[PDB]
């Protein structure tokens, strides 16, 4: 569709395809991307792939926009023109796409696989629209990251209440606890379906899991799990709502008598109500949770 | 004539069909507002079948006594009984001869509006005894058939084929199915459609059609079955998949009590309910309209054409209008001379087979009908089939008959009134051969100018004013004259029907051969007029009428058309007087033809020539498939000696049954004005250049509608489809001559909004770049010499 | 232009109430489709208000359908 | 460049054989599709077929020829009543079992046209407002 | 004049490029968003009206005061409405009467 570049905030019509958020990216920025990283396949409204019988160039300075399609160097019709080229990605809305260098923090961002911990140093101290790509970005790495997990199978039931497990050989095998939940299959002949939402946890003796179910189904052998996925959503919202210092309180109306409890953090109160958004920070059990609740007494 | 009916009145009182209150209705004559009337006339059948009875004994007291004599209508009363013997010459006995060839040919259309024969489904022919229980495997009725004429068509001299395979021309197809019209009315409909058969293909058996059984024709056999075979070829496996043994046979039994159609089966295990959206509203147009001064309380041009929405049961209400065909008995002696003189109509073009590589189809892209909808469009089969085993199919269907599902299709489109509309899609092993068989003479038809059909004839360039000068082709008191045919395409007899296919065949005396022909009659008929329609995952028998999605729709309702123009001259020139007919050349006319269609058995083409000469000399005709414009003698139409509306009447009450109400029908005194409405285009008298011209105007209405309402969401966008205004304007442009000046402001509307949306366009292409097109030829679209050039004869 | 325009309201208004899958209740889509019909084939602007308040009556009475606060705060 | 727009017209009327070469192929592997699908749908529907009753009916047959008509109404084991109202219900098929065709056949389930269930006690002359007609019982022959 | 020729021979094509590429991009997006297009549509069309039934129901659908069922036209017909609070019976209740 048409969008916004992430970076400048211009009309644009591209993304980069080998990105894993697929980000709409002006003409400028586009090229200033694509010519210096690794990344070397943009989509447009259609991907820009090599339009041959059979042919498979993505990289954009091979391809020429020929004929009615996108044709690499020698499929073209005879006529060019030139994609990538004249220091822009053809694109639409290419004369009005105009950028700025954050165009070295981005491809910092782009590349980065989240291993080190500077990547996060420069994903938070960055500029706005970059601190809301650089979460989704790694949103979507932490999400990507489950595919090279191992699937499990059952070995049998001696007991009902503790599974029996065994991973699959090759590949690692997730930590135990209440954070990771798994899908099952059945895939024998004969119904390759989930079978319920399952959880494990291991057991002290020998080995064993002392599993939990949504449902009641049990596992004819064959019966298996696999971690469960999950898309990530736009970054639709800022993380911050921009703020607005009110003169006076604005939809909020305090209290009579509001407790002899919580007459002490009147002010902060006030100074909630005057401002749009507000900040509490103190020490452990020094009265932050209760001072929201003081909050609800007020208004 | 419902204005002057005091005998048929008193003929329905006097026989107890009604009640003499009967006739306080408002349209108790109507057959689909007041289908009760029906039933009324029904309760003359019986009083018309002993007519019949006493006219074979009376004849056979001819035969016994010699006595030769010319039976006709007016010599038998009521009960039955003869009393004038005035013309009757007496022979040696044993050897005499009535001659009844005009007494069971007017009485024809009788027999089937008053169910003469609705006796003969009782046992032992009485109408209190109970219903002959048939046996439900019996198919084959040639031995009724043959009782049943030799009782009541006993006399009737010329020889009767129970099954049309054997009929020696189309002018014996015609009388025999006929007959068989009349006499299937008596037999289970169960006994009809295919004749299916099991056969085994590498040893599974399937259940395949190997004949067919129809109403009109008969039993119809297969040439070629082969009952062991080991694979099947794409060809036989197309016809395998398009013809309904295998889907009728495989499905859930039906009990359809929404309709009164005969319903076969349930394809599916549930019952679909399709429904018609609205349309979609461009309000950029709308508001640019009222902000110009459209729409106002009071104005005369107004929205009237809509997107009507549909519920679920629209497709099996609209369906159930096949409820307004009925079997029709024709006069087979007047039938058999108009169709003399149609075919005279379509002497000037050339037709027969062509081959598979000179078929030309339009658009590829449309849907194959049922069932091969499921896996491509037409082009899918256009494509995996080689000319080699097209024309395999093509000659497979002249010794074969291949019966085919049509589905219903629900029309999205815009509309006057909110009754749903309804297309046929026809199967492509039926519409491939249909062109295969008639597109040369299709085509020969659409390139012809100055004819009575007027078929491939544009309006634009001078082609409207060209039709209308050809249509007032040296009449001598010229009236314009133009008709309606109601339930047009669902009320159509299947004799007609019949009659419109024989002669689009008769271009194929080199080609084929007679059985050649007969086979794709047959193959007509089981594909397009008797056929199983898919109705919401449901088949259906259709009763019969012309569907519209067959190849040649248009063009066999022209021949129609032509049929019944010529039937509403003859029956008024033979109901005329005859001692009060001044010219003796027309008094001559009239005895020859009442020679020739009654005392006549060979065709005299002298006289089919001179009738031909004086229909086109008097009742000049212009015929678009149901539309007609007439510009016949004035003086001749009321001395009775041309068709006029009431002649119109009367031809489509007794052999359409429908009532044609002439509020629909419009004449035109004046010339100069052009006919009222024909194509939905009103005709104006303009002077263009220097000469005066007929030119063709819309409704505004329709203009409008058409701006406002689109059927899609991206229509509504405006700058996309600048060439859909462009196109509304070139339709509106002649709106500017009308001396209406809210008429004349459309296309000027058009014009500032095809030009406000290159202005935003324009706009919108500089905003998403900064520069603008180098070339743009768009500023002669608001420009009116695109359109005044569109309307002039130079191309 | 009222008449004229009530008549563009009622199509509008299908429109969405074909969008909300109110054509999945067939009860409920024939009382639309008839109000529709009725109100474009109408030359009386009262006869169309009244069909048209029994019309929108079913866009209102679909809670979680549309957000009316939301789509009145527009205007 | 008189050996030169030759190279022009090599390269042009190459593309063009080379395109009307896939499309006449494409056009192989898509023909190959729809002839699996055809056979399928057949071979589907022979296995539908209530063999024993069908057979019964075509030896009956003296040609072995019988009307298609007359096939699912001699036949067919399961039949569908669409029935637009309570009065047509009434006539047709009021009960558990009813008669049609010359048989007996029993209900199995009623639906709406929405496709919901409908229990027999709901159809009644008070309770007819209230559904969604038309109604589409199927029954099985007994 | 054979190089400027070829050029405005590419630069045609640039611009048949150009045109069916934003025709194909708007017509897909507009689908994309016609369900909140037509509503807000649907609501200045209404607002443009400015009946005093509809702009009653309006309102009281603001509140919260929607029917329950189709709205009748008949007569004697019964009209099934859910109201939220003692301020939308106050204002619409008068008695035994309710206006709506
Ligand atoms: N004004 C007060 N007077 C007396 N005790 C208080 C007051 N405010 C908070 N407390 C106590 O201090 C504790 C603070 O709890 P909480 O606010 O949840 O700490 P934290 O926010 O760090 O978790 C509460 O359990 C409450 O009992
Ligand atoms: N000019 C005439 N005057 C009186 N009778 C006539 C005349 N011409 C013929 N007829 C008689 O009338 C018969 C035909 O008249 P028609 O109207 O058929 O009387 P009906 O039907 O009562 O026999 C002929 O058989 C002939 O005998
Ligand atoms: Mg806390
Ligand atoms: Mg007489
Ligand atoms: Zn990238
Ligand atoms: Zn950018
Ligand atoms: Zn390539
Ligand atoms: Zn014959
Ligand atoms: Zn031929």
């Known amino acids: 569709a048409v969008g916004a570049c992430v970076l400048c905030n211009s009309q644009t019509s591209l993304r980069c395809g080998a990105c894993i958020r697929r980000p709409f990216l002006c003409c400028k920025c586009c090229y200033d991307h694509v010519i210096s990283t690794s990344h070397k396949l943009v989509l447009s409204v259609n991907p820009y792939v090599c339009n041959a019988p059979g042919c498979d160039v993505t990289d954009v300075t091979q391809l020429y926009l ?192 509001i407790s002899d409890e919580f007459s002490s953090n009147v002010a902060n109160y006030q100074k909630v109500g005057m401002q749009k958004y507000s900040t509490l920070q103190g020490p452990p059990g020094t009265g932050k949770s209760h001072f929201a609740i003081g909050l609800a007494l007020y208004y | ?172 197809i015609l009388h025999c199915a006929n007959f068989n019209v009349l006499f299937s009315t008596v037999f289970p409909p169960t006994s009809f459609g295919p004749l299916v058969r099991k056969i085994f293909v590498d040893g599974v058996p399937f259940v395949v059609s190997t004949g067919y059984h129809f109403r009109e024709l008969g039993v119809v056999h297969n040439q070629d079955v082969n009952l062991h075979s080991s694979r099947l070829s794409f060809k036989e496996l197309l016809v395998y998949a398009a013809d309904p043994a295998m889907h009728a046979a495989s499905g859930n039994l039906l009990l359809d009590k929404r309709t009164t159609c005969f319903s076969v089966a349930a394809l599916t295990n549930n019952v679909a309910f399709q429904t018609v959206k609205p349309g979609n509203f461009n309000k950029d147009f709308y508001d640019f309209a009222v902000s110009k001064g459209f729409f106002k309380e009071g104005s005369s041009v107004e929205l009237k054409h809509f997107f009507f929405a549909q519920d679920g049961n629209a497709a099996i209400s609209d369906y159930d209008y096949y409820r307004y065909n009925l079997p029709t008995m024709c006069d087979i002696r007047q039938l058999l001379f108009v169709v003399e003189v149609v075919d005279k109509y379509f002497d000037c073009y ?395 402001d459309v296309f000027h509307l058009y014009l500032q909004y095809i030009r406000k949306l290159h202005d935003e366009l324009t706009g919108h292409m500089l905003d998403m770049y900064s520069v603008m097109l180098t070339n743009d030829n768009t500023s002669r679209y608001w420009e009116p010499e695109f359109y005044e050039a569109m309307y002039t004869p130079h191309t | 232009s009222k008449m004229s325009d009530v008549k563009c309201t009622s199509v509008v208004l299908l429109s969405v109430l074909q969008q909300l899958r109110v054509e999945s209740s067939s009860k409920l889509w024939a009382q639309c489709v008839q109000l529709h019909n009725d109100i474009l084939l109408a030359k009386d602007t009262t006869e169309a208000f009244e069909k048209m308040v029994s019309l929108l009556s079913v866009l209102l009475s679909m809670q979680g359908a549309v957000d009316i606060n939301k789509l009145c705060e527009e205007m | 460049d008189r050996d030169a727009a030759m190279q022009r017209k090599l390269e042009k009327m190459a593309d063009q054989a080379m395109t009307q070469m896939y499309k006449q192929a494409r056009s192989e592997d898509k023909r190959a599709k729809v002839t699996s699908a055809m056979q399928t749908m057949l071979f589907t529907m022979l296995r539908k077929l209530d063999n024993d009753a069908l057979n019964n009916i075509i030896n009956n047959a003296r040609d072995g020829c019988v009307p298609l008509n007359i096939i699912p109404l001699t036949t067919a084991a399961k039949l569908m009543v669409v029935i637009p109202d309570y009065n047509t219900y009434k006539n047709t098929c009021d009960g558990t079992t009813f008669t049609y065709a010359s048989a007996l056949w029993e209900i199995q389930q009623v639906v709406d046209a929405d496709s919901k269930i409908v229990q027999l006690s709901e159809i009644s002359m008070d309770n007819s407002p209230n559904l969604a007609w038309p109604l589409i019982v199927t029954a099985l022959r007994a």
């Open chain 2, 350 to 744: 050339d037709g027969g087979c062509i081959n598979a590589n000179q078929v030309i189809v339009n658009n590829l892209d449309k849907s194959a009908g049922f069932p091969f909808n499921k896996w491509g469009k037409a082009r899918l089969y256009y494509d995996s089939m080689s000319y080699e085993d097209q024309d395999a199919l093509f000659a497979y269907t002249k010794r074969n008959v291949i019966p085919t599902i049509t589905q219903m299709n629900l029309k999205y489109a815009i509309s006057a009134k909110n009754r749903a509309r309804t297309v046929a899609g026809v199967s492509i092993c039926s519409t491939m051969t249909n062109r295969q068989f008639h597109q040369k003479l299709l085509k020969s038809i659409a390139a012809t100018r100055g004819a009575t059909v007027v078929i491939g004839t544009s309006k634009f360039y001078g082609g409207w004013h060209n039709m209308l000068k050809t249509v007032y082709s040296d009449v001598e008191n010229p009236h314009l004259m133009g008709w309606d045919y109601p339930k047009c395409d669902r009320a159509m007899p299947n004799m007609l029907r019949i009659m419109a296919s024989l002669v689009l065949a008769r271009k194929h005396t080199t080609c084929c051969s007679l059985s050649h022909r007969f086979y794709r009659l047959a193959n007509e008929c089981a594909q397009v007029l008797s056929e199983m329609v898919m109705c919401g995952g449901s088949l259906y028998v259709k009763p019969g009428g012309t569907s519209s999605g067959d190849a040649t729709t248009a063009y066999a309702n022209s021949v129609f058309n032509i049929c019944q123009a010529v039937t509403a001259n003859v029956n008024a020139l033979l109901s005329t007087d005859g001692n009060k007919i001044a010219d003796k050349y027309v008094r001559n006319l009239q005895h020859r033809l009442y020679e020739c269609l009654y005392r006549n058995r060979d065709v005299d083409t002298d006289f089919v020539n001179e009738f031909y000469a004086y229909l086109r000399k008097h009742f000049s005709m212009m015929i678009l498939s149901d539309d007609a414009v007439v510009c016949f003698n004035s003086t001749y139409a009321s001395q009775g000696l041309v068709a006029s509306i009431k002649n119109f009447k009367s031809v489509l009450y007794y052999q359409n049954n429908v009532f044609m109400s002439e509020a629909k029908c419009w004449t035109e005194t004046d010339l100069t004005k052009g006919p009222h409405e024909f194509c939905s285009q009103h005709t104006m008298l303009v002077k263009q250049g220097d000469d005066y011209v007929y030119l063709p105007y819309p409704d505004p209405s329709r203009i409008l509608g058409a701006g406002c309402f689109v059927d899609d969401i991206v229509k509504t966008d405006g700058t996309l489809m600048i060439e859909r205004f462009v196109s509304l304007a070139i339709d509106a442009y002649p709106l500017t001559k009308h001396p209406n000046q809210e008429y004349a």
């Open chain 1, 66 to 257: 020929g004929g009615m399609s996108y044709y690499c160097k020698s499929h073209k019709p005879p006529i060019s023109f030139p994609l990538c080229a004249n220091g822009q990605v053809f694109g639409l809305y290419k004369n009005t796409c105009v950028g700025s260098d954050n165009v070295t923090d981005f491809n910092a961002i782009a590349t980065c696989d989240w291993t080190n911990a500077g990547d996060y140093i420069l994903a938070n101290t960055c500029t706005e629209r970059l601190k809301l790509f650089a979460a989704e970005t790694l949103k979507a790495t932490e999400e990507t990251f489950k595919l090279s997990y191992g699937i499990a199978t059952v070995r049998e039931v001696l007991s009902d209440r503790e599974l029996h497990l065994s991973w699959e050989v090759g590949k690692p095998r997730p930590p135990l606890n209440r954070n990771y939940v798994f899908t099952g299959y059945r895939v024998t002949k004969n119904s390759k379906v989930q079978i319920g939402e399952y959880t494990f946890e291991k057991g002290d003796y020998g080995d064993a899991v002392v599993y939990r179910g949504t449902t009641t189904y049990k596992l004819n052998v064959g019966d298996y799990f696999v971690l469960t996925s999950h898309t990530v959503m736009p970054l639709s919202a800022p993380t911050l709502v921009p703020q607005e210092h009110y003169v006076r309180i604005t939809g909020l109306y305090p209290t009579l008598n």
């Open chain 2, 1 to 172: 004539d419902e204005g002057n009916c005091d005998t048929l009145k008193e003929i329905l009182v006097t026989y107890n069909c009604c009640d003499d209150d009967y006739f306080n209705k408002k349209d108790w004559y109507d057959f689909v507002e007041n289908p009760d009337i029906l039933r009324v006339y029904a309760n003359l059948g019986e009083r018309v079948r002993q007519a019949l009875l006493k006219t074979v004994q009376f004849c056979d007291a001819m035969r016994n006594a010699g006595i030769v004599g010319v039976l006709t209508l007016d010599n038998q009363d009521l009960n039955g009984n003869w009393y004038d013997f005035g013309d009757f010459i007496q022979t040696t006995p044993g050897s005499g001869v009535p001659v009844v060839d005009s007494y069971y040919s007017l009485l024809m259309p009788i027999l089937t509006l008053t169910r003469a024969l609705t006796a003969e489904s009782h046992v032992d022919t009485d109408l209190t005894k109970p219903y002959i229980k048939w046996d439900l495997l019996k198919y084959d009725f040639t031995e009724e058939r043959l009782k049943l004429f030799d009782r009541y068509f006993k006399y009737w001299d010329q020889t009767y084929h129970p099954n049309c395979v054997n009929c020696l021309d189309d002018r014996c």
